[PDB]
């Protein structure tokens, strides 16, 4: 139709495939696949196959996959190279889908679910599944229904059916406000016991077996928990029924504290959306909790509730179930906006790989390159093992801590992939080495020019300029595909307009939507036929034109990801095409590039500004420099500017018309120094920051590498109505920072940058005065409770015991056998508050489970012995002092000679 695959797996000598057929129905076949590998062969043996080094290869076709494996072992034991794709799944997909795959998302079943498990303490262990599962919400993309399984009787409390009528009402009516677009989509099912529930879920699972299985923390929590819960109740044979092929592998992960389990379900592609989100979204974040990211994207959040989640079922079972339903919806809502599932599908099919393999750049790119080469009848190298040898990364400049009033930043386009292309860095294009000087000698163009014949990197490598590098060529293919699918996206917008504009006064005539290609600008005979169309037709035609512009969108984003994920592969020892010298050629070219243009920008501005030896470039990171514009503004006289936009415009134009062209001369020269294959170092202006004109604000400041704040007015072409605060590494969003302090610090920073020292002082005085009337929870710090027992000594602090752990210990002694409520669980977060001397708790601090109130047993006592002074000093004043000191400011007004006079 054509066929495409859904999932593929290798079990024994058989490939197990789930796929949509010619008729568009989901099917499953088991194919005894017959793999071919390749071996080097003599000058004479002659054929169409050659390895990437141009050495002839003879093909070996095997009886089964097991023999092919034996063969590799054998080849490699002798010492012979064993070439070809040793992951037979990719070879299967490559042979079975030997054409560009087009897929129908709607035929692919995407399950999106969430579990709830009441436990006494709150945070149940998935590998143990000790506690009943008391709510499952499983959204199905095919049905577009939410399947809610609700346990009514449980040792932790017997409750009664959730109310879909209440769920719908507003807060005021004691409603949960489950959105209308959803309410009708909910298929509620309650159960008298857990065994009943699970069995029903398991069977529901066979009837609608997910292809892509997602949700939030589904890999680390939901999936193992459900798996182990069932393994524990019904035994393993039953638990394995969560795999279409009844095959399962339990992998363990290790870290500083515990060991996670991660269940591999053969026949299913798990795309945990938190990982998915982390890896596809181009913005780092302080939290990746569902609620935070939901707030960030949707502006709404997860359902609110009273008390701990560990008590929400007994206390408010209504809210509990509605909250579960919404948690799932939020993930859907985010995906409806961000579209990472489809992006995964698009990428998966493009590379011809298990969809989940979008999490593995080495795997993804290996497939892409393997396929590309296969069609040239080329043979891929055998993967060789290598030591994990660290190597230089990116240049980061040590900023001089200070205020920086006017600032402009420039960065480099797709730096690493650009360098790969410019230098022509591939395993087979390596042509030699040169004797190498220290890096700074190449930076300053003082070292002897490396080569007049080969393309060079400052790490002392040389590459051919004639040949066509496997790698560089392959990432160019992707730069082109991106340009191509933006074409489509635009022609599909200029076509949406042509459609929108005949919709004003169509004909009432009855006709059909035209059969045209929306990727290309409508011809003339279609320009007319479109007028004569009816509303109903034109309306379909637009839905189609828009759907196309969105396929253009997806495709071009997809390419950006591939492009950007390549270098990560190249520096990974497990990559087929890894080579340490190449990884080093790239990163140290980068360092040279940034510092060389750094010097170039400095020379230019000193010159152009009359000065000599001024340091214009104040900071730099990887592929972006930060230039101080103070002397450029003074050179013109600030007095000459009508308003903020006046000076912003001026710098925009100054960067565009003078700096950028100098910058480009600077890079063309570097290209020639290194005799590179082509110039691809393109640096353009990004941000324009500074105080509003005529105000007292400082514009911005740096406390050190990656720690700084700027008041930005322009980001490339786009300019902001109100300036944007660019804050980085100042911990004004870090989880530990008390919520009130987070808002207070951002405000301080804003005032410093936009209004001045006096405004800052006004606020500091303001917040200090207000501090002791705030809710204790908004001013408490947050920490993770790691190694609790390690520092537990008869209930008292051990040696080298962290401050927050001490708080937890103080807390445990105060709640020794009570409600019990609540309990501090290992690995989880806690609020932390200091205590004054001579408190009943017998220590200088106390910590309790975050997101909860302090049990009434001790709350008021705690609040009475809070050390506000220490709290304010450690959490607020300490950080603020760091800022002010760096920016050369006083947050408290200095004594004056006129202090005594009563003006
Ligand atoms: N040309 C080529 N064929 C390969 C490679 N790896 C596996 N093959 C096999 O070659 C056939 C395609 O020519 C398929 O049956 C693959 O199984 C490779 O790296 N290059
Ligand atoms: Cl983003
Ligand atoms: Cl971009
Ligand atoms: Cl704006």
Author numbering: 1 to 903
What's the paper's own text on this?
The gp43 DNA polymerase of the RB69 bacteriophage (RB69 Pol) bears primary responsibility for the faithful and efficient replication of the viral genome. RB69 Pol belongs to the B-class of DNA polymerases and is closely related to T4 phage DNA polymerase. RB69 DNA Pol synthetizes DNA with high accuracy, introducing one mutation per 2 x 108 replicated bases. This high fidelity is achieved through the combined action of its polymerase (Pol) and 3′-5′-exonuclease (Exo) activities, which enable stringent selection of the correct incoming nucleotide and excision of the mismatches resulting from misincorporations.
In order to understand the mechanism underlying this effect at the atomic level, we first crystallized and solved the structure of the PolD714A apoenzyme at 2.60 Å resolution. Detailed analysis of the region surrounding the D714 residue reveals, however, an interesting rearrangement of a hydrogen bond network propagating from the site of the substitution towards the catalytic center of the polymerase. Inspection of the omit map calculated for the 712-724 residues of PolD714A structure, at a contour level as low as 1.5σ, confirms the presence of the D714A substitution, as well as the appearance of structural distortions in the vicinity of the replaced residue. These changes are most probably the immediate consequence of the abrogation of polar D714 side chain interactions. The new conformation of E716 appears to be stabilized by a 2.7 Å hydrogen bond between the O-ε atoms of E716 and E686. The movement of E716 most likely triggers a shift of its surrounding residues, in particular R719, Y720, E722 and K724, which comprise the 27-28 β-sheets surface of the RB69 Pol palm subdomain. Importantly, the distortions of the hydrogen bond network around the A714 amino acid domino out towards the polymerizing center of the enzyme and eventually affect the position of the catalytically essential D411. The D411 residue, located approximately 15 Å away from D714, displays a large rotation of the side chain and a slight 0.3 Å shift of the C-α atom. These rearrangements are most likely a consequence of the new conformation of E686, as both residues are spatially close in the native apoenzyme structure.
